[PDB]
Amino acid sequence: MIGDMNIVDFVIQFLSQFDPVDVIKGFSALGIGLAMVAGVGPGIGQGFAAGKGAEAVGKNPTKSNDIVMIMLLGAAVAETSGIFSLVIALILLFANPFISSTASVWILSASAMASGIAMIAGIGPGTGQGYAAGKGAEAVGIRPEMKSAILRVMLLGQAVAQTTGIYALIVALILMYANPFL
Amino acid sequence: MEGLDFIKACSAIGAGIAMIAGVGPGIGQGFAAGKGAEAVGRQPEAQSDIIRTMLLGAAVAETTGIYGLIVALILLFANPFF
Amino acid sequence: MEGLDFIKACSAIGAGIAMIAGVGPGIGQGFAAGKGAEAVGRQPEAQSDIIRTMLLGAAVAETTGIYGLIVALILLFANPFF
Amino acid sequence: MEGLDFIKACSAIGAGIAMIAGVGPGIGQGFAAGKGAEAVGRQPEAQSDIIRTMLLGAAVAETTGIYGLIVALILLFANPFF
Amino acid sequence: MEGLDFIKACSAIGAGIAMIAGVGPGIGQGFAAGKGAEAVGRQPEAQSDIIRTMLLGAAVAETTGIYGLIVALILLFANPFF
Amino acid sequence: MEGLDFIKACSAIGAGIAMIAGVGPGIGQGFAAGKGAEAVGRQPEAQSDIIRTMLLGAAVAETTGIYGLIVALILLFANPFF
Amino acid sequence: MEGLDFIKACSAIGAGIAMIAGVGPGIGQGFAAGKGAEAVGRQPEAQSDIIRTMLLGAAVAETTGIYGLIVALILLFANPFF
Amino acid sequence: MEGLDFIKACSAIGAGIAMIAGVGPGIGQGFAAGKGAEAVGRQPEAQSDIIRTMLLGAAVAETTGIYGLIVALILLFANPFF
Amino acid sequence: MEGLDFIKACSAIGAGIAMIAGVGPGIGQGFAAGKGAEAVGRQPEAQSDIIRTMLLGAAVAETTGIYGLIVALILLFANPFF
Amino acid sequence: MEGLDFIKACSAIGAGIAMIAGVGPGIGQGFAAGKGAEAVGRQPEAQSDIIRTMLLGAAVAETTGIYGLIVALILLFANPFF
Ligand SMILES: CCCCCCCS[C@@H]1O[C@H](CO)[C@@H](O)[C@H](O)[C@H]1O
Ligand SMILES: CCCCCCCS[C@@H]1O[C@H](CO)[C@@H](O)[C@H](O)[C@H]1O
Ligand SMILES: CCCCCCCS[C@@H]1O[C@H](CO)[C@@H](O)[C@H](O)[C@H]1O
Ligand SMILES: CCCCCCCS[C@@H]1O[C@H](CO)[C@@H](O)[C@H](O)[C@H]1O
Ligand SMILES: CCCCCCCS[C@@H]1O[C@H](CO)[C@@H](O)[C@H](O)[C@H]1O
Ligand SMILES: CCCCCCCS[C@@H]1O[C@H](CO)[C@@H](O)[C@H](O)[C@H]1O
Ligand SMILES: CCCCCCCS[C@@H]1O[C@H](CO)[C@@H](O)[C@H](O)[C@H]1O
Ligand SMILES: CCCCCCCS[C@@H]1O[C@H](CO)[C@@H](O)[C@H](O)[C@H]1O
Ligand SMILES: CCCCCCCS[C@@H]1O[C@H](CO)[C@@H](O)[C@H](O)[C@H]1O
Ligand SMILES: CCCCCCCS[C@@H]1O[C@H](CO)[C@@H](O)[C@H](O)[C@H]1O
Ligand SMILES: CCCCCCCS[C@@H]1O[C@H](CO)[C@@H](O)[C@H](O)[C@H]1O
Ligand SMILES: CCCCCCCS[C@@H]1O[C@H](CO)[C@@H](O)[C@H](O)[C@H]1O
Ligand SMILES: CCCCCCCS[C@@H]1O[C@H](CO)[C@@H](O)[C@H](O)[C@H]1O
Ligand SMILES: CCCCCCCS[C@@H]1O[C@H](CO)[C@@H](O)[C@H](O)[C@H]1O
Ligand SMILES: CCCCCCCS[C@@H]1O[C@H](CO)[C@@H](O)[C@H](O)[C@H]1O
Ligand SMILES: CCCCCCCS[C@@H]1O[C@H](CO)[C@@H](O)[C@H](O)[C@H]1O
Ligand SMILES: CCCCCCCS[C@@H]1O[C@H](CO)[C@@H](O)[C@H](O)[C@H]1O
Ligand SMILES: CCCCCCCS[C@@H]1O[C@H](CO)[C@@H](O)[C@H](O)[C@H]1O
Ligand SMILES: CCCCCCCS[C@@H]1O[C@H](CO)[C@@H](O)[C@H](O)[C@H]1O
Numbered sequence A: 001m002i003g004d005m006n007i008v009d010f011v012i013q014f015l016s017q018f019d020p021v022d023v024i025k026g027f028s029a030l031g032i033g034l035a036m037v038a039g040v041g042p043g044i045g046q047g048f049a050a051g052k053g054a055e056a057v058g059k060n061p062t063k064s065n066d067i068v069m070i071m072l073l074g075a076a077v078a079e080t081s082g083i084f085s086l087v088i089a090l091i092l093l094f095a096n097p098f099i100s101s102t103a104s105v106w107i108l109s110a111s112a113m114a115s116g117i118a119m120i121a122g123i124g125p126g127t128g129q130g131y132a133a134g135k136g137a138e139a140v141g142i143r144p145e146m147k148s149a150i151l152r153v154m155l156l157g158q159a160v161a162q163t164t165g166i167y168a169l170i171v172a173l174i175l176m177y178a179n180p181f182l
Numbered sequence B, C, D, E, F, G, H, I, J: 001m002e003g004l005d006f007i008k009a010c011s012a013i014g015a016g017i018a019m020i021a022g023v024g025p026g027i028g029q030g031f032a033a034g035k036g037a038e039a040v041g042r043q044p045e046a047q048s049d050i051i052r053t054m055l056l057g058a059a060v061a062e063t064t065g066i067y068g069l070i071v072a073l074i075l076l077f078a079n080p081f082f
């Protein structure tokens, strides 16, 4: 307890003294940093693809073009979760839909932060899709005549792996542009 | 600074946190995708069975992503706290 | 700060946190899906056995996802605190 | 607010956090499921042995998931704090 | 709301956090389960030694889950702070 | 009111956090159990040396789990702040 | 005590959180370094091709690390909130 | 409250957080235990060289666990802030 | 001027958070070290190339740890917020 | 409570958080240790070169653990904010 007010009432009073927009901006900054945590995923996954690509080229150097092609295509797919988070952060930085709002400061602030929190889901697809890229590169190095079939199955599976990244992006966009709480 | 607004604010956060469940299927299904590609490459003749097994297994891996989404959507559009 | 409101608000948050449990089965069952796809490609004639085993094991892997969902549904629709 | 409403609210938070433990068995048992499916496809005649081992080990992996649920249930329905 | 209420409140949260420890044995024991099932498929005649070794190792891996449980239970029913 | 009970409340929180360390040995020792089981199946006649090596290595992996438990015990029963 | 101070404080913390993104490339590129070292050992005559491929892939894996840094630097040195 | 008591409370929290470092050595040394046990099973008369190498590498892996312990012990028993 | 202390306090927290980036290179470079040691055992004649490749890749995996360090050092010794 | 005490308190938290970096080298060096032990078992006569490679790579893996320690030590014993 802080003096007499419980810590919750203390924190609310503390936050209450500021113009609402400053509070909203502050929580946006947090939302912004949190969104970027998604970048862990493509880093792990694309690095895996890099390793499998290096291994495959070592085994079959005359096929480096096909190996590298699928490594890069698959890695491009893995990048999307990272791009999405970057977009959300950039929106919260430079086109913030909460700051110029009439509604409750608590709701706008929480929503700003919540938008970034949701984007953390992007770790999953980035990691998984990058793993898939590396296996694609590996398989193509072993059997380049199957590169088309390997690419398609890799892309199908990568698409399935994307959905929870999309669900999260959808929740953030709802908080930002179709908020039921306002 | 009504209690109602504080319920709604924490509902936003709860909803956002529910989406972190999505990390799991992303990784797991990625693994499934990579094994599918590896397997189709090795035995193109079995690709129909391989792809069907990968998708079936991937559907199962999806459920806890859906459970998180459902909780988020409940907090957003069918909140029981108000 | 009305006590009822603070209880409800924190219930929303804890409900979201409980769903983080869902990360686990998503990873594990996706691994299961991948191994299943790999085994079917290797031995198509055994795919009935492979899939039954994959599914049985994935079902066991689902339970802690369900436990998380249950706690969230309790907080939402059968809250013992009010 | 009354001291017990605050305790209740955090109890809801503490309950949700307890369920994070469930991430563990989800991953681990999923791995067991994948290895089980792989071994069955390799040697279907030994599937009785493979599956029994898989389940016994998975049963062990379940416990810390149960431990978390118990703490959650204690906070929800048998709370020592009020 | 007394300071004692705040202690109980944070004990409820500390207890939940303690259970996060449970993630580890869940993963590791699941891995042990998978390797055990793999080894059994490869050599069913050796399953008694394989299983005993698996359960011995898993028992060890269980301890830090118990440590977390012990800390939670202390916070819940033998709290040194009140 | 303030001060002493705030330290005790945060100590409860610190103690729980300290147990998160337990995640590590749970994973690592479960991996060791799996490799040990696998090796025993492969070379039953070497199982004594296999188990010995596994347990020695597991013992070492336990330490930071214990360092964590120690810090929690200090916060609970030998707290230097009060 | 100004609202400006609250913005800056949150920006300081948010900049720090953004750098957590850097965990990913550190793991992934370390994996690439390991596979490249292994590949060169097996096939030293392909060393130039193996390394160029490793570095191209590692360059791609770097980007989300750079995105995090850029966001941190914006929050520090070109903050749009003030 | 007195600022000194706020310093002590946060130090308790910081002490617990520092122990999270222990997750790493638990995982890594567990891996080494597993590889050591595997290698001993395969090459019984190389056992001493295997174990020595495993222990040497484990000792190195221990260090960041110790660094965390030291920071926590500083916070607990040799705190510079008061 | 109280607000400047608030900024300073949060910068200290932000600086620590930035160092979490260091988890990544620790894991990745340890993998490279293992693969390098394994490759050297397999083909000792190639060790200078193996190691050179291992270190080159390790240098790349280092960058995001350094980015974290830099954000920490900015918040500590060249802080633009005060 | 003086602003200084708030800075010292937050610095204690920041120092704890900085140590989280240590999770990484613990995992990575433990991996190196296991691969080194495995390589020595396979080829005992190459053990001096294997161990030297292992330790070199491990030393590189240590640095971001050292970076975190340094940030914590700064916050503890050379704190620029007061
Ligand atoms: C995610 C896509 C980023 C675009 C990068 C273009 C790289 S271009 C790339 O260069 C390689 C050098 O080894 C060639 O082997 C390969 O055939 C070529 O596609
Ligand atoms: C990220 C979505 C990728 C969609 C599939 C690629 C179109 S088709 C694909 O084109 C690639 C680049 O031209 C080539 O690697 C390959 O030869 C060709 O089949
Ligand atoms: C490219 C992937 C990310 C997709 C982002 C979807 C939202 S895009 C978003 O749309 C708003 C509509 O009002 C615009 O005001 C805003 O400028 C724009 O950034
Ligand atoms: C919504 C899916 C977007 C990505 C398309 C993936 C590759 S295209 C895809 O390939 C599959 C596997 O060979 C086929 O079964 C399917 O007919 C075809 O549409
Ligand atoms: C998240 C991974 C998704 C990768 C999908 C790449 C192909 S997306 C797109 O899908 C269309 C079907 O609607 C196809 O007709 C078209 O060829 C394809 O480019
Ligand atoms: C998340 C689980 C997704 C479940 C998808 C159900 C069938 S989806 C359907 O399945 C075909 C089977 O070959 C694919 O080739 C095709 O591209 C796809 O559209
Ligand atoms: C991990 C699942 C939950 C813990 C295990 C509870 C067993 S569940 C229970 O088990 C019985 C025999 O044990 C079976 O006869 C029955 O089909 C099944 O429902
Ligand atoms: C962390 C608890 C276990 C610490 C290791 C206990 C000694 S274990 C013992 O130590 C001998 C010393 O010469 C080694 O040579 C031998 O290989 C080993 O078995
Ligand atoms: C590092 C752990 C030190 C433990 C010190 C021995 C017990 S000391 C003593 O133990 C009792 C526990 O219920 C209580 O009277 C009290 O909380 C505690 O200070
Ligand atoms: C945008 C792509 C950045 C990474 C490019 C990967 C191959 S870059 C490659 O690096 C080698 C390192 O020794 C040099 O020998 C070679 O001249 C150079 O082209
Ligand atoms: C790549 C940008 C980050 C590294 C360089 C720091 C930005 S340069 C920056 O510019 C401003 C003066 O014009 C001030 O904020 C500050 O004194 C100065 O460091
Ligand atoms: C590339 C994204 C930005 C990363 C570096 C942070 C901005 S750097 C900073 O930007 C200021 C904006 O007013 C300039 O006035 C100043 O000269 C410049 O140093
Ligand atoms: C906390 C784990 C400490 C490691 C367990 C005791 C081994 S101590 C370790 O042992 C190596 C192998 O004999 C020696 O060569 C080395 O000098 C020594 O540091
Ligand atoms: C790497 C970006 C941050 C670089 C900050 C410039 C250091 S400047 C210098 O730094 C010393 C410690 O390093 C402090 O003791 C001293 O007060 C400070 O002025
Ligand atoms: C690679 C170096 C990047 C350093 C980040 C730009 C900081 S700019 C920085 O502003 C500080 C304000 O105290 C001064 O201490 C310092 O001398 C000045 O250069
Ligand atoms: C959501 C976080 C809310 C945190 C509010 C509690 C910090 S209130 C804190 O009080 C201190 C001494 O009175 C001052 O030094 C400091 O400037 C002020 O922010
Ligand atoms: C402080 C913990 C250090 C962890 C690393 C173990 C020491 S490894 C150490 O480092 C040298 C390179 O710097 C190696 O070449 C050499 O083999 C060895 O003396
Ligand atoms: C923590 C940094 C460790 C040193 C990294 C750069 C060392 S430089 C490196 O040093 C090795 C032995 O010292 C030699 O094997 C190698 O030829 C030399 O290039
Ligand atoms: C990356 C290394 C940065 C430098 C290490 C921390 C220096 S911190 C610096 O140290 C000076 C000498 O001890 C003190 O006089 C001063 O008060 C303190 O701010």
Ligand SMILES: [Mn+2]
Binding pocket: D002, D003, E001, E002
């Ligand atoms: Mn009362």
Ligand code: NA
Binding pocket: A160, A161, A162, A163, A164, B025, B026, B029, B062, B065
């Ligand atoms: Na999905």
Ligand code: NA
Binding pocket: B060, B061, B062, B063, B064, C025, C026, C029, C062, C065
């Ligand atoms: Na599922």
Ligand code: NA
Binding pocket: C060, C061, C062, C063, C064, D025, D026, D029, D062, D065
């Ligand atoms: Na389960």
Ligand code: NA
Binding pocket: D060, D061, D062, D063, D064, E025, E026, E029, E062, E065
């Ligand atoms: Na267990």
Ligand code: NA
Binding pocket: E060, E061, E062, E063, E064, F025, F026, F029, F062, F065
């Ligand atoms: Na243990």
Ligand code: NA
Binding pocket: F060, F061, F062, F063, F064, H025, H026, H029, H062, H065
């Ligand atoms: Na240890």
Ligand code: NA
Binding pocket: A042, A043, A046, A079, A082, G060, G061, G062, G063, G064
């Ligand atoms: Na990238």
Ligand code: NA
Binding pocket: H060, H061, H062, H063, H064, J025, J026, J029, J062, J065
């Ligand atoms: Na170390």
Ligand code: NA
Binding pocket: G025, G026, G029, G062, G065, I060, I061, I062, I063, I064
């Ligand atoms: Na890097």
Ligand code: NA
Binding pocket: I025, I026, I029, I062, I065, J060, J061, J062, J063, J064
């Ligand atoms: Na390093």
